[PDB]
Design a binder for this molecule. Structure first.
Ligand code: 3PE
Ligand code: 3PE
Ligand code: 3PE
Ligand code: 3PE
Ligand code: LFA
Ligand code: LFA
Ligand code: SF4
Lengths: 208, 60, 323, 162, 113, 150
């Protein structure tokens, strides 16, 4: 129920294989402590592409307060950032810039596609748009929407936190196994199918 | 620069600090997602479903 | 080994170690309190989910920054790059090292005191200079040049702002400066010294509205841009420890230090210090950022003659009252 | 007191030797700052507290800041400096080193032939230095202000960009 | 005395423990955490000649810092110097402010052109 | 009933920002007038080319269902002509120039945006200034890059 990824510099320059979860009880507790610290302090790269970035900085404001999750520092440097939110369209002139900024980020790093443009190109199936940011960089969380509302971005933040909290990474670069192990978690569609199909009645659209 | 300009600017900085302090003495405007559920209007354009007729058959 | 002298030595060493650990913990918890008080100032809550009230957010950030990959650029010079956050931390920590928090609770009762603080600030400008040069980035280079010239423009009168309190107390010692405030606090006579020292201490701490990397983010010309992991964390922790140091020095130099009517002296010192930390947060959250030429013009044409005139008037008052 | 003096003197000597034999200007300036800190420690060991405070405030806090400022603006990448290493070439440096060596032995002969009752290390505060400065040394203060003014005017006139 | 040497020991322990604390912070940051490679990782982040006014500002800081050291020496001995030393320091500050005004009026302290 | 604020003759950053505050106040006045006087009537025109038709008539009338069926599948047939509309947008004047060739798709869609003009005006106005002046000028233009590029 895990995937093993090791990188060695077409993009992405990684190869993944399905592997059994390896997990002493002290090493496991240290791994959960490291994962807890990584998931409760996630610093996003302040990267503005399009309208989805306007919704992201709406999520950062007072009526939403994304600071409650410890994800508010909003670094302008990719070295100091933990999370790349592709919040906008992957234009062909901007795609090498996105690749360069993602390369300049440091491990551990995670990617959230925010919006239909970053997911698959969205409505812009046009000559000057890369059809999704997963064509050239690996994505951890996808948010459908055009735009997603700010609480959808927070929901993806919680999904990323839950994905980090059960993934395995080396504690030190001199001791252990240096490959990155990511959990193959259950899809949210199959998890929410029980509560979504049973919905019967909704409020009529003629009211407030 | 003018001394009067300096004094007016000092007073304006003090006024800005005072206003941010009274804004600290205000009510929180944050909607506490996810503990507070997000209210949506009935015609909100979110997740797409297919529905059924009152007889129970699918309407599509 | 049982002797009163060795016991006094070990208790003094333990007091110094306790003071140092409390200062480091207060600086980190004040980074967290910066976040929380900004949330309070901006009609929100800030981090209140990691632990009770967000109290474990600092531990989560510390674990993240320790286990973040620490990386040094190939084009960079290793020693200077590794040395700059060490300066940014150690200089203002050892600047705190002279601050008396209570009667009998001081690490170094030096005869120079705020002179030693001036030594540490003059060494602290090297952190910004070395971060700019070491990273081998031209944007960070001009950013560090701009920030360093700003800090020189305010360090040119930081000590002269302190000289009014020095003249009133008649000594460079910190404890004598506190004891001279037993009747009236120094904020009343040395009010111009108080505002000039506030401006200079904010500017040499690289705090808002004198912060350079937050001023121009579009240019990406900050000198922190190539630091990551525990080096950038040391930059931030040294910045907040410098805020604590400047606030405590302000309390001891203008607000009587630990002197108070009813509460224990450390309670008064902590209350006044935490009030000035809250005022740091309010200054960051309230004032807009001036331009570079405007900032250094305010440093040169206005504040330095004000400090010189304040020292002259303070001397005239002192020799007028000495019959 | 004496142990700190000897350690700081050794550190200053080794640091200065590293400055006069280096190719990187920033490394040389950093070693010069380290030697200034060590000489400040020597000053603090001898009871001249004000002298050490001024060494780190002014010498290691203003003048070396100015040198570092200039080296930053030059962007010295060692053009025909690291590619030459002519000071490390022996027949260049043998002469001046032996010149400074025989001068050092003559000065050491001068130093060793004087009466020495030892330095008691009594701390001389900055208050006494200030009393002397504005007492028996007043024309020194005013004409040193004029000297700093002269340096100000001279280096403003020279170091403009236009 | 015992108190002064205990103060010296406490100060030495303070400096040593602070330096060791930041050194161990570097050791923990460098030793812990996995490392991974990217092609543009080693390239400096550049968002995907310096003027002589910097030298002038640093120079003015140096000169006025030396005159500041003179006023530092004056300020700790103001009462014993009396009114005579007050007159000398007034002349000193008058020369300082005249030089400052001269620097202001000729645009030496004017950053913008 | 609303007023159009104007400046004194010089376009500073501060003058533009205060003007946009004034148009915010005037838009609040227009919103108050809209709230007090909203007519009772249809939300769609009775033209045969109203796309889509009113939904309930589509759901119970066969001719309306035919109109809706052809308007949402193939598209409505605009006769071959050229049209133009310019409006006062939130950032300037925004215009659509639409050339129809008689089909259900636009033959030409030309979108004029004011941000293109303002980004082109930048080098003439920021010349001889500082970099922070450029940052303030960028912040005071009221543009977006989707408006520029589109
Ligand atoms: C290095 C610094 C050198 C300069 C400072 C030296 C020390 C202080 C010396 C005294 C300063 C007095 C300043 C002038 C006060 C009266 C005029 C005034 O307030 O002008 C500012 C502003 C003018 O109004 P305007 O900008 O035209 O706006 C249109 C509304 N009529 O009016 C306003 O904004 C409204 C009124 C604001 C009043 C603010 C408080 C004034 C008094 C402050 C005393 C000290 C407070 C210390 C901090 C306390 C809170 C933490
Ligand atoms: C522990 C220590 C610290 C504790 C925290 C509390 C103290 C923090 C102090 C922060 C000080 C910030 C000072 C910022 C000065 C900025 C000066 C400047 O450059 O102003 C530029 C502006 C316009 O300049 P001008 O040349 O006229 O431009 C014309 C172009 N059209 O000119 C103007 O706007 C004119 C007025 C300039 C500013 C005057 C000084 C204001 C200082 C801030 C208010 C402090 C009030 C007291 C707060 C409580 C203190 C306990
Ligand atoms: C990367 C590392 C770089 C180097 C870092 C520092 C290296 C040395 C660290 C170990 C130091 C051990 C302790 C040294 C002695 C401390 C006590 C002392 O100096 O006592 C003497 C004196 C006592 O004063 P007092 O009692 O008032 O005098 C009356 C007569 N007893 O008190 C005095 O004279 C006080 C004045 C001197 C205090 C010096 C403090 C350190 C100065 C260097 C700071 C370096 C900052 C970081 C690097 C900057 C860039 C290079
Ligand atoms: C340990 C082996 C070497 C390890 C590597 C180097 C580490 C740094 C070594 C130099 C600095 C520390 C020297 C040791 C000081 C220990 C304390 C001491 O000796 O105090 C004596 C004296 C106290 O004052 P006093 O009143 O004279 O005492 C008489 C008794 N009542 O003290 C004094 O009067 C003044 C004490 C010295 C001045 C203060 C500290 C100056 C620090 C300068 C650092 C220079 C840069 C070092 C860089 C290192 C890496 C290259
Ligand atoms: C921001 C404040 C930083 C303070 C750093 C130093 C802390 C020292 C704590 C000393 C505590 C004991 C003080 C003497 C006893 C009198 C007070 C008793 C009640 C606390
Ligand atoms: C291109 C110009 C280069 C000039 C280099 C100058 C080098 C001078 C070296 C002097 C060496 C003196 C050696 C000792 C001489 C005898 C003892 C001193 C005089 C009694
Ligand atoms: S998905 Fe929609 S809202 Fe998001 S960037 Fe694309 S067009 Fe804008």
């Amino acid at each position: 129920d895990y995937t093993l990824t090791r990188i060695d510099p077409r993009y992405p320059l990684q190869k993944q294989e399905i592997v059994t979860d390896p997990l002493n009880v002290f090493m496991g507790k240290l791994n959960d402590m490291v994962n807890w610290g990584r998931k409760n302090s996630i610093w996003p790269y302040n990267f503005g592409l399009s309208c989805c970035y306007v919704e992201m900085v709406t999520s950062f404001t007072a009526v939403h307060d994304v600071a409650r999750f410890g994800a508010e520092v909003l670094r302008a440097s990719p070295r100091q950032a933990d999370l790349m939110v592709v919040a906008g369209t992957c234009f062909t002139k901007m795609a090498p810039v996105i690749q360069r900024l993602y390369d300049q980020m440091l491990e551990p790093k995670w990617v959230i596609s925010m919006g239909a443009c970053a997911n698959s190109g969205g409505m812009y199936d046009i000559y000057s748009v890369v059809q999704g940011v997963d064509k050239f960089i690996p994505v951890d969380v996808y948010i459908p929407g055009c735009p997603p509302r700010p609480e959808a971005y927070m929901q993806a933040l919680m999904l990323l936190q839950e994905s980090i909290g059960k993934e395995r990474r080396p504690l030190s670069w001199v001791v252990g196994d240096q490959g990155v192990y990511r959990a193959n978690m259950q899809s949210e569609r199959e998890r929410k199918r029980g509560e979504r199909i049973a919905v019967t009645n909704l409020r009529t659209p003629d009211e407030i | 620069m003018t001394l009067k300009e300096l004094l007016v600017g000092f007073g304006t900085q003090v006024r800005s600090i005072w206003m941010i302090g009274l804004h600290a003495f205000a009510k929180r405007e944050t909607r506490m997602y996810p503990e507070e559920p997000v209210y949506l209007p009935p015609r909100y354009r979110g997740r797409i479903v297919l529905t059924r007729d009152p007889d129970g058959e699918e309407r599509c | 080994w049982i002797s009163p002298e060795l016991i006094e030595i070990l208790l003094t060493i333990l007091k110094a170690v306790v003071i140092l650990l409390v200062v480091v913990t207060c600086g980190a918890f004040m980074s967290f309190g910066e976040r929380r008080l900004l949330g309070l100032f901006q009609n929100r809550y800030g981090p209140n989910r990691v632990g009770w009230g967000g109290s474990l957010q600092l531990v989560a950030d510390m674990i993240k920054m320790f286990f973040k990959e620490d990386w040094i650029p190939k084009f960079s010079d290793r020693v200077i790059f590794t040395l700059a956050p060490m300066i940014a931390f150690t200089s203002l920590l050892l600047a705190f090292a002279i601050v008396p928090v209570s009667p009998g609770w001081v690490v170094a009762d030096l005869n120079i005191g705020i002179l030693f603080f001036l030594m540490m600030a003059g060494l602290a400008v090297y952190a910004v200079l070395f971060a700019g040069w070491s990273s081998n980035n031209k944007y960070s280079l001009l950013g560090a040049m701009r920030a360093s010239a700003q800090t020189l423009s305010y360090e040119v009168f930081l000590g002269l702002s302190l000289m009014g309190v020095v003249a009133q107390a008649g000594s460079f010692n910190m404890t004598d400066i506190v004891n001279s405030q037993a009747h009236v606090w120094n904020v009343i006579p040395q009010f111009f010294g108080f505002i000039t020292f506030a401006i200079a201490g904010v500017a040499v701490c690289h705090r808002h509205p004198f912060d350079q990397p937050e001023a121009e983010q579009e240019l990406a010309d900050g000198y922190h841009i190539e630091y990551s992991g525990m080096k950038f964390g040391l930059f931030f922790v040294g910045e907040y420890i410098g805020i604590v140091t400047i606030s405590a020095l302000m309390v001891t130099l203008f607000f009587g230090g630990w002197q108070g009517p009813l509460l224990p002296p450390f309670i008064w010192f902590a209350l006044k210090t935490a009030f000035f930390m809250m005022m740091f947060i309010l200054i960051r959250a309230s004032l807009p950022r001036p331009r570079y030429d405007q900032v250094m013009s305010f440093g040169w044409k206005i504040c330095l003659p004000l400090t010189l005139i304040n020292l002259l008037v303070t001397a005239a008052v002192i020799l007028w009252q000495a019959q | 007191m004496e142990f700190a003096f000897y350690i700081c003197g050794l550190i200053a000597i080794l640091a200065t030797l590293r400055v006069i034999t280096h190719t990187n200007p920033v490394h040389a300036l950093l070693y010069l700052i380290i030697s200034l800190l060590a000489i400040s420690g020597v000053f603090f060991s001898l009871g001249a507290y004000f002298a050490g405070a001024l060494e780190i405030i002014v010498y290691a806090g203003a003048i070396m800041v100015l040198f570092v400022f200039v080296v930053m603006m030059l962007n010295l990448g060692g053009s025909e400096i690291e590619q030459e290493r002519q000071w490390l070439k022996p027949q260049v440096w043998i002469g001046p080193a032996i010149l400074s060596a025989i001068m050092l032995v003559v000065i050491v002969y001068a130093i060793l032939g004087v009466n020495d009752q030892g330095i008691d290390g009594t701390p001389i505060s900055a208050k006494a230095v200030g009393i002397t400065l504005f007492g028996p040394y007043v024309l020194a203060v005013e004409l040193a202000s004029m000297l700093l003014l002269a340096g100000l005017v001279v280096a403003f006139h020279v170091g403009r960009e236009e | 005395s015992t108190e002064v040497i205990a103060h010296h020991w406490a100060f030495a322990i303070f400096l040593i423990v602070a330096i060791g604390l930041c050194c161990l912070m570097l050791v923990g940051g460098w030793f812990l955490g996995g490392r991974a490679r990217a092609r543009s990782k080693n390239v400096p982040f550049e968002s995907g000649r310096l003027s002589a006014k910097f030298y002038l500002v640093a120079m003015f800081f140096v000169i006025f810092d030396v005159e500041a050291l003179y006023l530092f020496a004056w300020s700790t001995s103001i009462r014993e110097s009396g009114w005579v030393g007050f007159v000398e320091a007034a002349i000193f500050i008058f020369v300082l402010l005249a030089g400052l005004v001269y620097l202001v009026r000729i645009g030496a302290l004017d950053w913008t052109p | 009933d609303f007023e159009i604020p104007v400046g004194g003759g010089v376009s500073d950053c501060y003058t533009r920002v205060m003007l946009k505050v004034e148009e915010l106040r005037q838009s609040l006045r227009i919103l108050e007038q809209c709230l007090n006087n909203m007519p009772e009537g249809p939300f769609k025109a009775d033209h045969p080319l109203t796309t889509p038709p009113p939904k309930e008539r589509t759901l119970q009338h066969i001719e309306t269902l035919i109109t809706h069926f052809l308007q949402v599948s193939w598209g409505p047939v605009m006769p071959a002509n050229e049209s133009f509309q310019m409006i006062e947008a939130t950032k300037g004047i925004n215009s659509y120039y639409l050339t129809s060739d008689g089909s259900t798709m636009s033959y030409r869609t030309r979108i004029r945006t004011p941000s293109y003009a303002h980004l082109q005006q930048i080098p003439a106005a920021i010349r001889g200034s500082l970099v922070s002046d450029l940052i303030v000028y960028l912040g005071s233009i009221d543009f977006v890059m989707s408006d520029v590029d589109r």
